Amino acid sequence: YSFSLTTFSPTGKLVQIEYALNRVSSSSPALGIRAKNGVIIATENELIEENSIFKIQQISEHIGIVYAGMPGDFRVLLKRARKEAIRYSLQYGSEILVKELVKIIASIVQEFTQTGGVRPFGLSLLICGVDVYGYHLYQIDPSGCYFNWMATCVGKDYQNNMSFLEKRYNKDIEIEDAIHTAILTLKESYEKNIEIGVAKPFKILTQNEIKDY
Amino acid sequence: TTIIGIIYDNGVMLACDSRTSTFISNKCSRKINRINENLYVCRSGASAHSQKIIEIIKHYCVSMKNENRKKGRFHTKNKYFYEDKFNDYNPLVENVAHITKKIIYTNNNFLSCALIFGGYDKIKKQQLYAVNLNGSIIEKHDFAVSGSGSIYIQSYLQDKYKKFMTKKECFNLILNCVKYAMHNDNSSGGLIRIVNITKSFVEEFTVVNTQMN
Amino acid sequence: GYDLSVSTFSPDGRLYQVEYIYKSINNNNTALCLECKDGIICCCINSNMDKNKMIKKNSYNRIYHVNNNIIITYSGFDGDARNIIDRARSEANTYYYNFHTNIPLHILVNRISLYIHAYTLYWHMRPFAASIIISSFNEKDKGDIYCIEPNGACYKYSGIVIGKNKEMFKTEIEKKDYKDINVRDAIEDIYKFILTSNNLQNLVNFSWICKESSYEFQNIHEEILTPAL
Amino acid sequence: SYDRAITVFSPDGHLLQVEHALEAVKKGGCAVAIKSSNFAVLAVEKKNIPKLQNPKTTEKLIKLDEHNCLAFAGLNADARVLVNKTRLECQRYYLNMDEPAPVDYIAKYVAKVQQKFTHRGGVRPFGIATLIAGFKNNKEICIYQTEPSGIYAAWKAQAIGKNAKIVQEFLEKNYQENMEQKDCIFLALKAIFEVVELSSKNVEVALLTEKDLTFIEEQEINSMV
Amino acid sequence: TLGPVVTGTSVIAIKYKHGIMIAADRKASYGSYAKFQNVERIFKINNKTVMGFSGELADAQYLHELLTRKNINNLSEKKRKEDMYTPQHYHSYVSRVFYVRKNRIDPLFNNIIIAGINSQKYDNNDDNVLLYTEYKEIHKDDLYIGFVDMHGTNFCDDYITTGYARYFALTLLRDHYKDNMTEEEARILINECLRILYFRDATSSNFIQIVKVTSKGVEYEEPYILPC
Amino acid sequence: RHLTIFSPDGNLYQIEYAIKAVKNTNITSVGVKGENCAVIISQKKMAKLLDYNNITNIYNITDEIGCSMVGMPGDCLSMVYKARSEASEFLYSNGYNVNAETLCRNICDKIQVYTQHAYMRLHACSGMIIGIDENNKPELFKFDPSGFCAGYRACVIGNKEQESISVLERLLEKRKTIDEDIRNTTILAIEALQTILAFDLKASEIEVAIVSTKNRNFTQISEKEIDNYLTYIA
Amino acid sequence: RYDSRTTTFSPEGRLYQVEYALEAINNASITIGLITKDGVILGADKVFISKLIDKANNYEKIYKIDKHIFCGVAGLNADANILINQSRLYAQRYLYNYNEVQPVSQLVVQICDIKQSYTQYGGLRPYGVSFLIGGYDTKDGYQLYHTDPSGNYSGWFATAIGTNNLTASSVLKQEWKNDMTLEEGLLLALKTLAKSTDTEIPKSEKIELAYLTNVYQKYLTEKEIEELIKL
Amino acid sequence: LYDTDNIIYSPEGRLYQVEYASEAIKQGTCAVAIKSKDYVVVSGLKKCISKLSFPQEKIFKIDDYIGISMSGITSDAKVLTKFMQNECLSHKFLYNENINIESLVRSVADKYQKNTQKSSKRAFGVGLMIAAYHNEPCIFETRPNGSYFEYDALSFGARSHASKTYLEKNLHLFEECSLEELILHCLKALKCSLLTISNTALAVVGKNHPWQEISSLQLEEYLSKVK
Amino acid sequence: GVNTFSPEGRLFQVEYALGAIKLGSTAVGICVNDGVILASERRSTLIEKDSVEKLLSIDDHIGCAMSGLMADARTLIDYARVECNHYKFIYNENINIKSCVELISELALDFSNLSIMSRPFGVALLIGGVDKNGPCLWYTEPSGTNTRFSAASIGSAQEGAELLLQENYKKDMTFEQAEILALTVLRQVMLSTSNVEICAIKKSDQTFYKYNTDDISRIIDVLP
């Protein structure tokens, strides 16, 4: 009973990838900005605890993750990314490079596009990180393609937010300026409903720090 | 080594020494392990085998206790009281002892441990079982002794035993038994740990004493 | 077109294959269990095979037992029920093998209900077409009776009926409380309910656990049933 | 479809997938085999875009072992994997018996493999038909033609591929027994040229002898009168 | 088991007028040390079948649990008393178990006796089998006493002694056993054999358990001390 | 909308249908955190001769951790056994007791593998889990058939979703010693269920389970306590 | 009924998934390859997603497989990367086996056999990517091989794949010669990439260009194309 | 739509594939089996497609005191026959006593049932008539849907209704009648189903009587006495 | 699916495979007391006639005539040859014809997976031989049913050959009478040596023997 659910259309399209792309397009917005001395990734009932619902997460000491799409798919992919980073660290004895982790996760995401009896992942990921080859921001789609970016946006209304950030973004920026631009873009797309993570080890900015910014 | 268990009126007292190994590697070792609040176990033989089967049996007892629960509403010493007043869901001593016997028998090609299970439950009242080297269980309705130092106190315990001993004289008997075994045996020494198990409460005594005559 | 598989919820949020299994079990032969003052009694009316006169007299016995002190009966397909009963016997044997003690009834009920439930998940397996009564009696605990539905549920009763005309048997037996009735005085009323809801002698199976069987599984003797008839 | 029946019987009684594999063979290029006293001649159509495609890379006439050669028609990747399997079995027989594999044995093996692929679960039939040529244990040369259906048969001369019926008729009305090498080569050329256009570059022809499978140079192919 | 540690000593079993009488002392020795002296060494398989062992105690307990599970498996698949398994069936099962274990070079370090009544005509005990709660004269051909060896060698006789009794009691039996023996004659003969074993065997004891497999089922007599 | 795969809209309708199945059972359960305790109150009814004491929705995964499942009963018991197996595996591998958060993470991963795979049916099961962590503070973690976990200060499973949030907000704002804290949390849970269901509740048809720092073990208060609290509220 | 039966013939003796994969590759970006007297030239087109990309280090078309073999991609990128990984694995496996660098044709045969295996065995979709694998070996020389989703490959002197490959092939037929220098080959590659997009002046911002010479692989930096554009 | 695969229950709650497998028995030839307190006799109609064809074997031995008749697909009958024979001989090798017919019929019914659950497999398209004398005579019926039944008398196959009516008429005679009378009764039932020395299969088993096909001559005077 | 029943209780794939065995050239098998004979028909001049062989020897003492899908037939005969030689190794004697036929029938229905192929074979076999019970001739079909026959025919012209076999066959026939009967039936349904191929297994030798051109011409000359 191992038969591929994702199948080529008569017009040469794997329409399940298009439908997962529509799903992540329907999800909450996410973005990332890369500065000369840093890289940030950010995202947008009164009873839910804010502590237990963090979309921004850490894979490694200098690698962070955020997503747009389904939460459970993100949790399993985060567990897999952490395991792959840990196995690289155990083998080569050093913290994993961003590009290798992105390639491994892209291959794993592409595998479910082809494996029989499964459907693709319904999310798009953003890796941020730092290594000896500088700062890195990488977007991974449901298709399994990894894109290297200077700055990017993912979720709802990502075309307008990309236009705004494109007119606002410069290569030579600071962490203060990058965080200000990220908050401006998020409030344009939209403090209590903002999450920011900066990468020196990867860090999560508390609500007090985000309020200060 | 010296591990002893003696039944007395409404209770059972287990007792052990602390010495481990010609060179004394350790001199404060808890040979009496708490499988459950109503059920303890004395260890003898190789320490690694004893620790591994005892923690496996703790895991099995947790599983049994979870499955024994019914649906709906019904109805320097240290002392503890049972959370289960009526023994609605605590596993029986015989069940734990027999699964331990099966564990030791199935892997008796290399396992070389001997155990004395002691406890209380509403069906059989207080209970003592002895699991031997090859994995043979015998219920000792009066007393069980094991370890290299137990051979020096067989006649002493056999002569001093009575059917319905009071708590005080049973405590004196078991304390003097372990003391004599420590006096005669090089492999046993250190402080004496005694565990008294009753219908409602468990007591855990620590004694420091030597032999003079 | 949402009912052609057990592994798919319809837009109403339900599994139609389970409801069709319920329909299959409901229009089948009748079974009942009842908890009396000092015993449990189990009865099974195999009236769907009344047209077949060639059958050997009193040989289609839907009542089975586990460990000589648990009754297990069913309504549904015979083979699937035998599969469930064999799994129950295997689980009891494994419990005694591990722990040297007879399995409690409710743990066996949970295990066999999980076994039934496991077939309702995958898309390549037929769910069980059988509803199982499993019951026991004790001197101190009195009678405990469990009905396991085909959907994996399991509910404790003080009396249960399944199969065809279950509403008639239920409303008839819900007239007298049997907790103050001896099990020997219940066979007459059960026969009366069978009349209300010639062939009565041979198309009926009976089983009992009380003092007179030393709290162990047994079939009621012909000499005990005949004066009650 | 890891283990599923792709090939099954139709209401009439046929296997539809085998017929579709036969259609795929009919799309394939034309190949021709002719026998002689102690040598064979295999000629197969070539289709190369001029000035861009490498002529040598496409290779429809293949050497299997010391004394067997193959010429297929159908799907090229299927042919490559089947030819690799055939070479592996040739060397396996020469390891397990210490004699070279005869042509009849290896033709039977290829036919058996195709039958197995038309019959096992989760497997597609081979969309290729082959013309194996080689030598027997008694030093006699022969040609075996094998279908996608798993049926094989020996032939004095045979044609496969697109417009195979016309070439078969031409071979029928022009074949003679024990003809010379020049006559055999010329007959193969004029037979395969009945359906493909008259040009030297649209064909590759080779002659199988006990020593080796020689390839005819393009100069010798040219000047065919 | 790689070899014996807590070992059980010999067992004696004979046929007599009303059924089977099987005797074993209640001692289990931990090497050369009487660690246990109240050990039940004869097991009740069912109402017309009992088992005894001589060898390692853990292996005997494992075999007893196996045969117990076989007994409840049989009882579950039972409709009439003739469906019950005789001592022949259990003897064949134990023989096959020992043979399969012998093929792997991993035996149960034991010598086993399976004994009982091999027919249902003498009583209706198994019409209503109860597990949790004058005699009739039975023909010798309807009784059964078996032997099974560590190598799987097995056989039957009117009287079987397993273990150290094979040299001591067996000789006496081969002089004194006779067909159609009363309960008293069988008892005094078995007591004499066990007295000789106690006087001339280190691992044996004088605390005996007798089990009778008779028309009214299996009967565990209260244990007693051999006088003198 | 048969397989658990994407529609042209992009949603997976099988999860929505499973959530509809959970809501169709008409079983209500309210979980409330406190200063040093957590309470779950559930309705205790099926999804004359029936034994009504046996009917329960709460369960004991461990002595410390407890839960309350709502949905299909077989799926509920299967999820209970999965939770117990997960906690047992954690205790075996790590030698210390799992907490509510990690157990909910693992259970939702187990739900997600069914969510992604076409050959697996989804469990029509929502569930609350409570316990005390190592810092001596309560936990209240809720999951649904979608495989999504979240911690709550208070939450409801049942029909009255995004309507009981209002009364829970009002009661928690109004409330905003260990014995007094436990008493107030239990009273708030009982009053919340009474206001949500909008009819007077008998003590013999509701089930209240409590975990706290005073008594680490998950336990259910007897019917006399519930009768006392119901008399106190009125 | 959920099985789509990807691995079955059609009534016309066709595999429909294979042709869908080919006409999907036809909608991908344009890729070009050719061989000169000194080295094998490959080049590609970049689908402009945004200027906010890190183009500095971005080669989403041409990839290195080994110091003697490299490839240019046309099709789905996620399907191409796994096959590139397999190609690298097989190259190092051959070097581990025979203590010798692999020939180009053997690696092409291995990856095309994997493609054929996906188009014949199981119930899985094919790989919808075509490769132009360039390389050097001592047995043959400079080689360029074109592949397909069907597992059918062919050797070429100069060819194109992707959108509007007919126009690129026409320009290559018109202009390509057997004896060409490296600079002439680069200029012809620029001309073909220009004519494919119907632009006389190519855009340096969206042209990837690389080559291999006897072994060393050069990936032209975004500044390096600008010297060739003016010439 | 509800009969495309064997795991789907109908809206009425029926397995259409298993019922089609049950329908497969009605195409087979008629077979009858009856018994007294001591003996069991099984009769069957051997199939002869043409006069050059030999008659098809209808009755098979399983053990010294167990034999069978089949109705349905012959390959399924061969599979089940080999299974029963191996089970009986395995019991006789492991143990020195005959297998219980109750356990053997339960095993065969479980084997029947195990094919009707997984989607890959299909239900057995054959009905089985097991005749034996374990310690008293007995006949068993086994159906595609995993169920089995005891029978005092039994018949099934093509045009089995007339023989069934004869059995319904004459059931009360079979207990006390002699073996000769029982053989004539079974042969008359098979005659009512519609008999020569070739197209009729006959077998007996009972007390101190292993499985035995009646000889050609003995069958000849038995058929003469039937006339 | 292949494992699915019709409402009439008949498997669809077996019913469809029965249509395949009709096609192919005609063959006849006749059994008499002295032995058994199988004659068969072969369907341009380029094909080597001896390469295609419609008669095969499963063993030294067994032969057959096959029809339907010929590649499946070759598979079945290879399996039967392996199993027959396995029997001869394990027991040191020849195998019964019924036992070999039952082995072939057991392999025929392996696709059902009742207790690995994936469809019926679509092959009809007419297997003749001589064993301790004398000569015999069995017939096997894709349905898995075996039938012992005194004489029978398979192939395209099955009905006409069967009618002539009913009309002309007698039990007490000499071997030459059976030979001329076989060639007469084949002459009616479709005669030089090129048309017909004959094999015989006799009680005297119990050995396969493929007829030569001289023998074929001889029995042609003996015919009217």
From TrEMBL, chain A:
List where the protein spans the membrane: none
Stored InterPro entries = Ntn_hydrolases_N, Proteasome_alpha, Proteasome_alpha-type, Proteasome_asu_N, Proteasome_sua/b
Subcellular localization, per the record? Cytoplasm; Nucleus
Q: Which residues form the Proteasome alpha-type subunits domain?
A: 1-23
Query: Care to name a GO molecular-function term for this sequence?
Result: endopeptidase activity
A Pfam cross-reference name: Proteasome
Provide this UniProt record's keywords sorted from A to Z.
Cytoplasm, Hydrolase, Nucleus, Proteasome
What domain of life?
Eukaryota
What GO cellular component entries does it have?
A: cytoplasm; nucleus; proteasome core complex; proteasome core complex, alpha-subunit complex
| GO annotation terms (biological process) | proteasome-mediated ubiquitin-dependent protein catabolic process; ubiquitin-dependent protein catabolic process
The similarity comment for this entry is: Belongs to the peptidase T1A family.
Give the NCBIfam families listed for this entry.
PRK03996.1 (NF003075)
Task: Please give the name of this protein.
Answer: Proteasome subunit alpha type-2
Q: What organism is the protein native to?
A: Plasmodium falciparum (isolate 3D7)
Q: Which lineage do the record's taxonomy fields give for this organism?
A: Eukaryota, Sar, Alveolata, Apicomplexa, Aconoidasida
TrEMBL record, chain B:
Example of a GO cellular component annotation carried by this entry: proteasome core complex, beta-subunit complex
Q: State the superkingdom.
A: Eukaryota
A Gene Ontology BP annotation from the UniProt entry:
proteasome-mediated ubiquitin-dependent protein catabolic process
Keywords assigned by UniProt? Cytoplasm, Hydrolase, Protease, Proteasome
User: Which SUPFAM superfamilies does the entry mention?
Assistant: N-terminal nucleophile aminohydrolases (Ntn hydrolases)
Q: Which InterPro entries match?
A: Ntn_hydrolases_N, Proteasome_sua/b, Proteasome_suB-type
Question: GO molecular-function annotation terms?
Answer: endopeptidase activity
UniProt-recorded name of the protein: Proteasome subunit beta type-6, putative
UniProtKB/TrEMBL annotation, chain H:
> Which InterPro entries does the UniProt entry name for this protein?
Ntn_hydrolases_N (IPR029055), Proteasome_alpha (IPR050115), Proteasome_alpha-type (IPR023332), Proteasome_alpha1 (IPR035144), Proteasome_asu_N (IPR000426), Proteasome_sua/b (IPR001353)
According to the lineage, what is the superkingdom? Eukaryota
Question: Which GO biological process annotations does it have?
Answer: proteasome-mediated ubiquitin-dependent protein catabolic process; ubiquitin-dependent protein catabolic process
Which keywords accompany this UniProt record? Cytoplasm, Hydrolase, Nucleus, Proteasome
A GO molecular function annotation here is: endopeptidase activity
Question: EC number(s) in its UniProt entry?
Answer: 3.4.25.1
Please state every residue range assigned to the domain named Proteasome alpha-type subunits. 2-24
The compartments listed are: Cytoplasm; Nucleus
**Cellular component terms (Gene Ontology):** cytoplasm; nucleus; proteasome core complex; proteasome core complex, alpha-subunit complex
Instruction: Name the family the entry cites.
Output: Belongs to the peptidase T1A family.
Q: What is this protein called?
A: Proteasome subunit alpha type-1, putative
TrEMBL record, chain I:
GO cellular component, alphabetical, reads:
cytoplasm; nucleus; proteasome core complex, alpha-subunit complex
Biological process (GO), any one: proteasome-mediated ubiquitin-dependent protein catabolic process
Question: What does the annotation say about its assembly with partners?
Answer: The 26S proteasome consists of a 20S proteasome core and two 19S regulatory subunits.
Q: Which family does it belong to?
A: Belongs to the peptidase T1A family.
Keyword annotations of the record:
Cytoplasm, Hydrolase, Nucleus, Proteasome
What domain of life does the UniProt record list for this protein's source?
Eukaryota
* PANTHER family, per database record: PROTEASOME SUBUNIT ALPHA/BETA
- What pairs make up the disulfide bonds? C84-C100
Q: What is this protein called?
A: Proteasome subunit alpha type
Keyword Protein transport attributed: no
Give the molecular function GO annotations.
Answer: endopeptidase activity
- The species is Plasmodium falciparum (isolate 3D7)
Claim: Cytoplasm is one of the keywords in the record: yes
- Cite the InterPro entries for this sequence: Ntn_hydrolases_N, Proteasome_alpha, Proteasome_alpha-type, Proteasome_alpha_type_5, Proteasome_asu_N, Proteasome_sua/b
- Occurrences of domain Proteasome alpha-type subunits (ranges): 1-20
Places the protein is found: Cytoplasm; Nucleus
